[PDB]
Amino acid sequence: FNCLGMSSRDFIEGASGATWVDLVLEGDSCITIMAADKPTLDIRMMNIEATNLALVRNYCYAATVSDVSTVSNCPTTGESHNTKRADHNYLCKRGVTDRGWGNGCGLFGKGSIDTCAKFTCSNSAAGRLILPEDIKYEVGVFVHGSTDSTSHGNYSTQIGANQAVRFTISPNAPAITAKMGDYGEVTVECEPRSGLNTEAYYVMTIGTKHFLVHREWFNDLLLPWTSPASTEWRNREILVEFEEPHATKQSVVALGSQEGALHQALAGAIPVEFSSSTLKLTSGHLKCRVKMEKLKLKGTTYGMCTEKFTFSKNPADTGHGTVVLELQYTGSDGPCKIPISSVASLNDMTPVGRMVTANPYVASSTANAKVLVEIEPPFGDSYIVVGRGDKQINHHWHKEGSSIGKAFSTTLKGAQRLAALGDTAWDFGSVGGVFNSIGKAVHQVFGGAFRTLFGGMSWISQGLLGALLLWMGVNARDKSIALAFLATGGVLLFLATNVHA
Amino acid sequence: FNCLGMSSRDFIEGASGATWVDLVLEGDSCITIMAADKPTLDIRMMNIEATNLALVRNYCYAATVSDVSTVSNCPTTGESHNTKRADHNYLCKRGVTDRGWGNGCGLFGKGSIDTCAKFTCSNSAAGRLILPEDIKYEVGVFVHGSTDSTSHGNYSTQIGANQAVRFTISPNAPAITAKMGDYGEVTVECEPRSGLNTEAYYVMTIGTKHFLVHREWFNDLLLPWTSPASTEWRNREILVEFEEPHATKQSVVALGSQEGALHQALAGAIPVEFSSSTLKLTSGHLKCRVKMEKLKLKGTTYGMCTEKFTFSKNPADTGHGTVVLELQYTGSDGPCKIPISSVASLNDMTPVGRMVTANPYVASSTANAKVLVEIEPPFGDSYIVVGRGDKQINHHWHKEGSSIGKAFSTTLKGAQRLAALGDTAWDFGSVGGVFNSIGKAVHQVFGGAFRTLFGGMSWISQGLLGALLLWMGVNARDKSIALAFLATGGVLLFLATNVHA
Amino acid sequence: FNCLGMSSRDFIEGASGATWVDLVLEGDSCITIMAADKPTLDIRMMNIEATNLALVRNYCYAATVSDVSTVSNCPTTGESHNTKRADHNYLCKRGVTDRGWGNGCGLFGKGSIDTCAKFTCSNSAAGRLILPEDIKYEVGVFVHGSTDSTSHGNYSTQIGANQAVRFTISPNAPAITAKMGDYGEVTVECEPRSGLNTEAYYVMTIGTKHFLVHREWFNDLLLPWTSPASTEWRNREILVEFEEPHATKQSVVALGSQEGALHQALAGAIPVEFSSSTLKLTSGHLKCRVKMEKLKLKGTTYGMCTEKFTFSKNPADTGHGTVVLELQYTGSDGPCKIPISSVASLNDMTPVGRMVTANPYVASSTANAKVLVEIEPPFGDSYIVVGRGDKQINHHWHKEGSSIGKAFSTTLKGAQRLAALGDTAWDFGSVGGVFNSIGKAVHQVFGGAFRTLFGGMSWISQGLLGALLLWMGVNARDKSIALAFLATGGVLLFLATNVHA
Amino acid sequence: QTHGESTLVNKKDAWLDSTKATRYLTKTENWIIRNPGYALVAVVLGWMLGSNTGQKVIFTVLLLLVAPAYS
Amino acid sequence: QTHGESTLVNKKDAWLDSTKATRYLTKTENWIIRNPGYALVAVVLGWMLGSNTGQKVIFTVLLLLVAPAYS
Amino acid sequence: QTHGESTLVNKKDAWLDSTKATRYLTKTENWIIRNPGYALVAVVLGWMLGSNTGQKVIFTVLLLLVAPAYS
Ligand SMILES: *[C@@H]1O[C@H](CO)[C@@H](O)[C@H](O)[C@H]1NC(C)=O
Ligand SMILES: *[C@@H]1O[C@H](CO)[C@@H](O)[C@H](O)[C@H]1NC(C)=O
Ligand SMILES: *[C@@H]1O[C@H](CO)[C@@H](O)[C@H](O)[C@H]1NC(C)=O
């Protein structure tokens, strides 16, 4: 959908020869495509929705113990067996006491003892598994045309203008052709099944809060767990402890609710929203290959507007190097093209900054029509000239940063994307694939070993291992092993710092 | 009280010509004192009682959060500075959220947001300290007279017969002398305040359960704590989580509880009984000195009996090397002393085995009377002979043990006692001398350094460090350094294995 | 009782200066005590009788499964947890099967299944523990006198003649004196508690046959075993086999009765007699110390016989070097002493061979009486001369063998006794000498390590180890290790060949 | 933070005595089972910078203990 | 056992992100402050065993990290 | 698991006295008869595995005993 007010924004240039573009389209991020002649596209994945989740295990984090009975025997006879052990829901643990003539036994030594405790679980942290055949990515596609600032985001008005259409990408419908009134039709051939790895994530519910935990972590919890639709609990001796072996009566006390321990254990879990068996989370990615073959700019171009232009909202930087401004057209000339450009100086009127909005025009024929325009001025001092002649609204603008700084920032963002996506990052912004295919293959080969050797290790441990590798490689003898150790240590340090810890 | 049926029992023999003997008097470890001619004395510290405790902190394991309100500011327009920050009992945290024209702001960027939440704590885990003056011990002393096995452990019949009394030791009453029927007056002059150090222990009340935790551990807890009788919670952001910075809204959630985390954190805490502000713990130790100058025998005037002794209860082994048997006197000759002794064989009948119950005597003049007798047979086969002539009754006993095995077991028990008690262990069963004082001084000067170096180290860490020290010492070139490292590693390994984990 | 026609009968000659000797009283191995002047008596313990046994573990060997039901779960759905698992006596085991579209599941793969079968035990082998106090050895003492051959074996006649008497030796009365009509009193000082190591033996009952098995073996069996007075079985999966995992149903069949397997497993188990909870085994040894201080002669007042003696039955050898003959008296001169001796030659008439039945006589005054006389002639030709003059009746005996052969035979017998007893064999015939004491001490020291190092090896494994030790010793370099290995290997095969297998 | 073994003499058991041999090892063993591929990394790191064989073993075991219990 | 950083690509924060830099270090620092006497022990053990200065520093820091986080 | 010879002094015969010389040999002899081809393997391995002549014989007999009685 619209990229306005999005923290993460990336721009992909569209080659004239290339007809299709491959992009990750990661969640909570907006990808804007700036083609040469075709109108600019910006696609944002809203959320991932799943349905019909099935239980796997029901961990208990709060136990109740009552009705304690104790049976003891003389030291010589075997271990005592309490009559309540036959009944289930009774946690029974044997033990040993000391018996004497005062206690009633005929011999001294380590007498046996057995106790029972009615075990009842109040609430359980049920876990659920997401089937890959149920996830439904929701993807929005937008074309920058004539949009009001208040309407730039209202889906009803945009779909009324046939500019923005939301479609749900599912394994049963991996390809959707988005139809637009005049810009043509844009087709996406996204692959939903490979996007979210539903085979390595559960949905753990702790009361009202829901999470998204890993396969291995949820199966290694040290809590009394039961199979779905099963009354009998397993491993009940964790929440229940026996204080001291007492021959007359042993006291059984249950530990407090482990709800806080679970929340502290969910350090890296991704909270989700669960309601009416409808999962709705936003994190994740879907590798889409957007085909811009049928996407065309409008053939008809209107004449330049002649009436005075007023800034409804002054030009404000979005932080991505693009300037968003809103123009209110005082006159009523019907559809006309706004004469807006970004120039280095008033001497030379040749535009220097590419326009994100494709041919901004005043679609409405009514007076005081508002049109939102986005520009990408060049670095340094610049002028945003709106209109021409005696009515031009000259507005100075200074854009911080330089080309080298932008290059370094883009390299850092690409490195972060590669670290946060693995091999799929080589498929971002790829049109040819002549060199990205071998790059993707070698990245898969390296990543398999990297996840095998290191896997789920904390950032501090990764940083320490990287520092150790650097220290032992700077003193290494052979150049090849030294270079390999230096590269591995650099990767570990980058991953440790990428967490921003 | 009676050492019968006790997990740990200690036998010490008083030195001839020594009026007093010093003993550490471990909790739940009944100690038996045998002298050359004084009646057998067994002393057991039943429990420790403390009253009028004072609070130190109030940690919170359960918190309730409501009245969540937030204020947001435009990007680059300063922080929100919510008005509730000065309002107490309101937890506020400042975050950054992206703001755009869609959210109603004028500019674009990370606009600061401050969310304040009403922090109300439902349940507090109050901690208390023990006043050194209010802690009073409870020591029970017993003299091994003649009592029935059924009445041997019953206190009412013993206090009626003046064979056992309960007296309390307090800082202002260190020396208490207890009078008995005819055995004399046993003087117990001990230092109560120097026995258990209350300057390093706290009483923590988590709901209903109570514990005795360290002062250093209790002050390092990461929980919202307040001073007693105050509602100002400090460091209270641990139990409250701010979900996600959203425009003009930020829902906050608190962790459900922390009882489970606390109970799991109290690994080695010592549970105690707390009721009506009257602490009652059965553990601890109390360095004690008992003066037996006024202790004297009873019934030495009576001669030997002239009737048949029948074993009403078959002899049983206590497991500490002493046999316990019950004798029934068939005749009616009034008070008389039983001529029972342990001999190596029937042909020699030379008394070789010491007798714990010194000078047994039939108390009542009834025709049928039952007397409990405890003996310490020598290693190997032995006979328990009662009298001479055709009226004697013999019993065979074959205790399983050896002199070398006894020495090894005694050395192991002494090492465990030294590890558990520390410096005060050198005063156990010591009547004085230069050896004990020098040993105690050396043990103190080494244990201070040992505790400073290894204060909170776990058994596993201690074992690993001991193994590393041994492996370093075996490779050490210097003899003295190698010997020191070997000794330190051996001590660490023994201490780790003493935990038996 | 009497020892006529009994194998493993070891004669013992007491020292003339001493009056008491120590015996071992093997199981069904009588020992005859030959004193210098006192009448010769033989004591043989008949059986070890115990009572009041207590259950320890009730093993099962006859399973019976029924009511088999199964529950199948689809893949990626969870475990099955058959509802009958809540009830006890229902063995359940979870398995994995193959699921498909035809099986009714949605997504096919590796499903889950569990099966519940009602496990009931029909026949249970119950083990019992023998209390050390309850065992009461039965010892019979017989004094050789005028006994007819027919009446020699009859116990009622000996009671009437007041020669033999049965007394029970128990730990409650280890020393018991025997009553004789005219031979005085015999006092024995046996040690029953140390005789049979009842701590390491059980009484296993399999059907109607009872066996005395080791402690370690009985606790290491692999069968469904339950604690005494406990309905809940434990480790039930041994006797139940789940054959075919099928989604529709799973076949559960119980294995056959393990009664034969136990009998095949009881290789060296000692069968015993059980009736009314009274164990009765004839094996075992009871160390004793028999005192003949009050043992005196009978018949010395009688004069010599006048009539002629006719051999009622021909003399017969015993196999231990002694001769048993029966003499018939023709006249009637009242109680008279039989003149009978063994002479090397008839020209000397000097008794050379001692007589086992000391002081033979004819108690009855009937005209014809039968008297059994047992002699111990020397090696070679010997003449049994009765009377003198014309009434002398002669008989020739040839004791085949030699002194050296008898020396080797008794050395081998002593070696077998040492192997079958251990240290108690050094108490056989000892009078408390220093040599025997140090021998027993060193034997205990060596045997502790010998049993610890070689605990439960079979006879063939012992032989193989001994052969390997011999081969290594004969090729060893150092003399000490060579001789040690030679001695150990010799002991090993002596033990291996002792069982005669 | 765990309380640890109390310095007071207590012949009986503490609040948690059954888990005395598991509290310090369950996390390490579960982490080692979780990602067993790290085991060879410690071995090769010890063999690389280890001057002595005993030193190599010490470094390997120290790394295998540091990695599960982070810091 | 903590969940750790998720393998999913999350632009937002996880359940606990403020304590991301403290959950792995507060326990170690609190243990070190509790008994600072151990600090010299690890230092001397590393210094007297390492054949090189870098090796000695590595061993010192490795032991000082092993001690707080048991196993 | 067989019970083995009892430590109690017994001049009588045990439960299975006849089979005392066969329980430990019948299985081995049946196996070696049923599988005569292993004998050459055992002797070859014994000859190769040792240098001394006696060591070779010991190896051969030990392997020939091991094979029928697994583990
Ligand atoms: C979009 O515009 C329509 C018509 O003005 C209005 O009803 C609707 O509420 C707007 N959308 C939102 C989210 O307010
Ligand atoms: C102790 O003795 C008194 C009187 O003999 C009796 O009432 C009481 O029940 C006894 N208590 C115990 C515990 O035996
Ligand atoms: C033994 O003597 C009794 C007389 O008490 C007699 O009845 C019996 O037949 C005799 N023989 C045997 C073998 O018991």
Author numbering:
A (entry chain A), B (entry chain B), C (entry chain C): 1 to 501
D (entry chain b), E (entry chain a), F (entry chain c): 5 to 75
Task: Copy text verbatim from the article accompanying this structure deposition.
Flaviviruses are positive-strand RNA viruses with enveloped virus particles. The E protein is responsible for attachment to target cells and mediates fusion between the viral and cellular membranes during entry. During the transit of the virion through the secretory pathway, acidification and cleavage of prM into pr and M induce large rearrangements of the spike at the viral surface, ultimately resulting in antiparallel homodimers arranged in a characteristic herringbone pattern. The C-terminal domain forms a stem consisting of three membrane-proximal helices (E-H1, E-H2 and E-H3) and two transmembrane helices (E-T1 and E-T2).
To demonstrate utility for resolving pathogenic flaviviruses, the structure of chimeric Murray Valley encephalitis virus (bMVEV) was determined at a resolution of 3.7 Å from a single dataset. Before cryo-EM analysis, the host restriction of bMVEV was assessed and confirmed to be similar to BinJV. MVEV has the highest fatality rate of mosquito-borne viruses endemic to Australasia34 and is thus too pathogenic to be imaged without inactivation at most cryo-EM facilities. Like WNVKUN, bMVEV has the typical structure of a flavivirus, where E folds into an ectodomain, a stem region, and two C-terminal transmembrane helices. Significant modelling differences exist in the stem region of E and the transmembrane domains of M and E between bMVEV and JEV. Given the high sequence similarity and consistency between the MVEV and WNVKUN structures, these differences are likely to result from ambiguous electron density at the lower resolution of 4.3 Å for the JEV structure. Comparative analysis of bMVEV, bWNVKUN and JEV shows that most motifs specific to encephalic viruses are conserved. In bMVEV and bWNVKUN, Lys16 from M forms a salt bridge with Asp28 from the opposing E subunit, thus stabilizing the dimer formation. Re-examination of the WNVKUN, bWNVKUN and bMVEV maps, as well as deposited reconstructions of TBEV and ZIKV revealed unaccounted densities of similar shapes and volumes to the bDENV-2 map.
